[PDB]
Ligand binder design. Structure first.
Ligand SMILES: [Mg+2]
Ligand SMILES: [Mg+2]
Ligand SMILES: [Mg+2]
Ligand SMILES: [Mg+2]
Ligand SMILES: [Mg+2]
Ligand SMILES: [Mg+2]
Ligand SMILES: [Mg+2]
Ligand SMILES: [Mg+2]
Ligand SMILES: [Mg+2]
Ligand SMILES: [Mg+2]
Ligand SMILES: [Mg+2]
Ligand SMILES: [Mg+2]
Ligand SMILES: [Mg+2]
Ligand SMILES: [Mg+2]
Ligand SMILES: [Mg+2]
Ligand SMILES: [Mg+2]
Lengths: 100, 152, 127, 98, 83, 115
RNA sequence: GGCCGGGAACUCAAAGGAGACUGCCAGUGAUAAACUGGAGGAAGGUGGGGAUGACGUCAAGUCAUCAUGGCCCUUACGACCAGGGCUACACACGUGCUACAAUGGCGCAUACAAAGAGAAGCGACCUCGCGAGAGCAAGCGGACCUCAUAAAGUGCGUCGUAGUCCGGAUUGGAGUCUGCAACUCGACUCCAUGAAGUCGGAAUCGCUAGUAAUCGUGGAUCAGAAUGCCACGGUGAAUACGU
């Protein structure tokens, strides 16, 4: 894909793992049942302050080589085309054509 | 088919009568692969008919069977746009198949409350030539009677 | 001594023990009628011992696993026939002539890519 | 008492590894139970083989994982020390627990 | 929708603007792009121009509008009819 | 068999018959009978005036018939008068709950209107 | 309570072997190739299923997976952000799901599978809630723990042919969960409502056996979002004279 998309993905990963702990603590405060609704209101208002790119839900899986955003497989980290290409040359250990 | 390779497949006897023909009837009556329902239905109907007749299930079923089975049918044969209706004989196994199929299809089209009652009433009627199945047999016989000029 | 037998059918496997006795039949620590509510299964189980007529002259201890109802009944047939062979060899031709000895190898076919089922195809239109 | 679990994508390599492990353990003096074969794992994948459209053209692939267990009873202090130093072949995952 | 134990949802900048407007008299209409923000009773009598995608539609908050969201009063599709 | 202003059948069981009230479903009917000690499979025909009175008093605990119609009418009128998205969808006679419109949507549009 | 002591017989697991070869018998045949039948055997003539696609055709599809000749833009045809749209709606077609019921709907009780996944994960037990769920919290990197009671079936009772105790579209009210954020535009729960539909014109599709038909279960994608796709078992038919 375009280089811009790859840059955006890298930046999103950086922001997410930079703000992970603070997001965790604020979300833990909000999710609690034994608390003060004023504290919950303050925590809600504070959670919006962070940049939107710090959410892990803002990241899209992509091929490690080409950047294709469709057809991903979590086990290998590649889309279908590159999986087949590499697998046909014996570069993925233990993988072979199936028949049963 | 073009090859003529098939043979014939084995059929199991019925549960509590030791008859193959009743098993074939149950198979004809079965839907969706639910054989237990069909066998219970046919058993109930046969029991009711035996009670209302007194002979047995076996020969009562047989007597209804001679009254519906055919003896000659027609086959089409295209010549020049129209078709010859050539009459040909029927093998006994096909006689039984056609009789059972006509019986079941006639019984399925009725207005009683249960399928067992439908089947019992229809087959009791057919035992003495009053149902729609015997009417279909008569129509087939008449149509085969008309076109015997082409029976070589 | 107990005579052993093993039967397999569809996805069901059964093991059978036969000894001299007064006609008791036990399946999975239950009676014959308790295990199989279906009558066809009962005649299926009892066919072999009835062909040779040692129903009340033997005692049968059977267990089953896997599959459904008819598969378990067929496995029971196979096991009892093999145990009867192991108990007496003069009966082999008699049970072979009835088809009891052949092992039924019919399995379920796999689903194939592009088809709704093993053989059913999707609906096709010319235009 | 020792549990040892071996994992491999290929059965020949893991069989040779199990043989050398059990022979080394037995030459020390301890007794062995096994090897016991655990169920093999099969993982399957199905992918499209065309860059664009053509839905019904696909390939199917399989990965197999073989796993076996060996038990060491009455271990000697020399047995375990010879056990770590065996340096099993690459491609075989070894787990040792006590 | 929004779980009861979490309360409503409002935007901090919008809340700040609303308070600063209310405490200083009924000023000019307030431009906003926040359409996911629910309506509070403090908003009654105000005029808020909500973005719809291309322009800013003025909404005059009344007592009946409390509870819903702003975007409900700014349609985003234009349709007159067919043929 | 004269409850809340309607005639209910007499050849039916209690639970089935009581659903004829606009505002009473199966669960509410079961709860109503369970609060008055009448067996579910007992017809309206075999009941004494005291029993019908007890049923009427139980049914009076709920909003039924004309009041429910007035409620629904007032709510839908409120929606149409606000001018919200749901109000416009009510005005237009089009799906309200985000269903697809390119096709289907016949139970809300009606029979096809050709060109 | 295979629960314990125990046993390596049995199911099973996974490595290594045997086995099926027109091998034997009879007949036809041109002594040939081969064909029809029989014995033994778990299996008989390619036992069943999958993988495996010759030389080429259609200037067939893909410059948006990627790679690349030539052309084109460079304060923009490149870059960043918020909001919206891809979800519209007089209409026409393709592929599906659910029905129009008594071989059925509903209530109570009880049998029998296979295959698969699990660490920013699967999550028991106990308590609260009618419910989706919430609180506390073992075990598991797994033939050990969790997912996770299989459904159709069976026995008993009711409904007795009615647009119904069939059908579940649309609509109102009150909520749960994921997620910064459910208006446009998520899934799910509860109460209320109860539309067309009584088997479908001219036409037209699939299937030769564990197949069609019917009943359930799992996985990839995935914060959440399957009636689609890819897999797994239960029950289990009719017919093939012929070209
Ligand atoms: Mg690039
Ligand atoms: Mg995503
Ligand atoms: Mg596993
Ligand atoms: Mg033979
Ligand atoms: Mg032979
Ligand atoms: Mg072209
Ligand atoms: Mg081309
Ligand atoms: Mg083109
Ligand atoms: Mg292009
Ligand atoms: Mg944007
Ligand atoms: Mg689209
Ligand atoms: Mg219903
Ligand atoms: Mg009807
Ligand atoms: Mg309801
Ligand atoms: Mg074929
Ligand atoms: Mg299946």
């Amino acid at each position: 894909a375009k280089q811009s998309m790859k840059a955006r993905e890298v930046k999103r990963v950086a922001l997410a793992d930079k703000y992970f702990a603070k997001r965790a603590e604020l979300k833990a405060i909000i999710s609690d049942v034994n608390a003060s609704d004023e504290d919950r209101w303050n925590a809600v208002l504070k959670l919006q302050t962070l940049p939107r790119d710090s959410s892990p839900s803002r990241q899209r899986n992509r091929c490690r080589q080409t950047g294709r955003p469709h057809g991903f497989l979590r086990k290998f980290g590649l889309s279908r085309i590159k999986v087949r290409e590499a697998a046909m040359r014996g570069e993925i250990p233990g993988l072979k054509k199936a028949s049963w | 088919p073009r090859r003529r390779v098939i043979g014939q497949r084995k059929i199991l006897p019925d549960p509590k009568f030791g008859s193959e023909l009743l098993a074939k009837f149950v198979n004809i009556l079965m839907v969706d692969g639910k054989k237990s329902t069909a066998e219970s239905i046919v058993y109930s109907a046969l029991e009711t008919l035996a009670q209302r007749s007194g002979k047995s299930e076996l020969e009562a079923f047989e007597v209804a069977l001679e009254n519906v089975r055919p003896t000659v049918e027609v086959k089409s044969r295209r010549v020049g746009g129209s078709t010859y209706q050539v009459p040909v004989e029927v093998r006994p196994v096909r006689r039984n198949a056609l009789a059972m199929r006509w019986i079941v299809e006639a019984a399925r089209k009725r207005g009683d409350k249960s399928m067992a009652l439908r089947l019992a009433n229809e087959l009791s009627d057919a035992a003495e030539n009053k149902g729609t199945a015997v009417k279909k047999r008569e129509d087939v016989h008449r149509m085969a009677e008309a076109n015997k000029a082409f029976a070589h | 001594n107990q005579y052993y037998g093993t039967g397999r059918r569809k996805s069901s496997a059964a093991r059978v023990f036969i000894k001299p006795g007064n006609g008791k039949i036990v399946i999975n620590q239950r009676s014959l009628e308790q295990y199989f509510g279906r009558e066809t299964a009962r005649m299926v189980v009892r066919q072999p011992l009835e062909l040779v007529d040692m129903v009340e002259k033997l005692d049968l201890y059977i267990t089953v696993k896997g599959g459904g109802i008819s598969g378990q009944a067929g496995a029971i047939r196979h096991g009892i026939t093999r145990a009867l062979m192991e108990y007496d060899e003069s009966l082999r031709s008699e049970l072979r002539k009835a088809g009891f000895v052949t092992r039924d190898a019919r399995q379920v076919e796999r689903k194939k890519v592009g088809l709704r089922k093993a053989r059913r195809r999707p609906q096709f239109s010319k235009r | 008492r020792i549990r040892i679990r071996l994992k491999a994508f290929d059965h020949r390599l893991i069989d040779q590894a199990t043989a050398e492990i059990v022979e080394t353990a037995k030459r020390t003096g301890a007794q062995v139970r096994g090897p016991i074969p655990l169920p093999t794992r099969k993982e399957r994948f199905t992918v499209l083989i065309s860059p664009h459209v053509n839905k019904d053209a696909r390939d199917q692939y399989e990965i197999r994982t073989h796993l076996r267990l060996v038990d060491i009873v009455e271990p000697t202090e020399k047995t375990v020390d010879a056990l770590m130093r065996l340096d099993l072949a690459a491609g075989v995952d070894v787990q040792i627990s006590l | 929708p929004r779980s009861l134990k979490k309360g409503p949802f409002i935007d901090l900048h919008l809340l700040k603007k609303v308070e600063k407007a209310v405490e200083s008299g009924d000023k000019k209409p307030l431009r906003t792009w926040s359409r996911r923000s629910t309506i509070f009773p403090n908003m009654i009598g105000l005029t808020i121009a909500v973005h719809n995608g291309r322009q800013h539609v003025p909404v005059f908050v009344t007592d009946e509008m409390v509870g819903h969201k702003l975007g409900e009063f700014a349609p985003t599709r234009t349709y007159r009819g067919h043929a | 068999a004269r409850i809340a202003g309607i005639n209910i059948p007499d050849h039916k069981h209690a639970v089935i018959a009581l659903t004829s009230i606009y505002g009473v479903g199966k669960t509410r009917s079961k709860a109503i009978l369970a609060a008055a000690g009448i067996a579910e499979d007992v017809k309206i025909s075999e009941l004494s005036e005291g029993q019908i009175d007890t049923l009427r008093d139980e049914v009076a605990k709920f909003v039924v018939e004309g009041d429910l119609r007035r409620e629904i009418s007032m709510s839908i009128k409120r929606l149409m008068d606000l001018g919200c998205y749901r109000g416009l969808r009510h005005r237009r006679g089009l799906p309200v709950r985000g269903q697809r419109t390119k096709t289907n949507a016949r139970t809300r549009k009606g029979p096809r209107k050709p060109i």
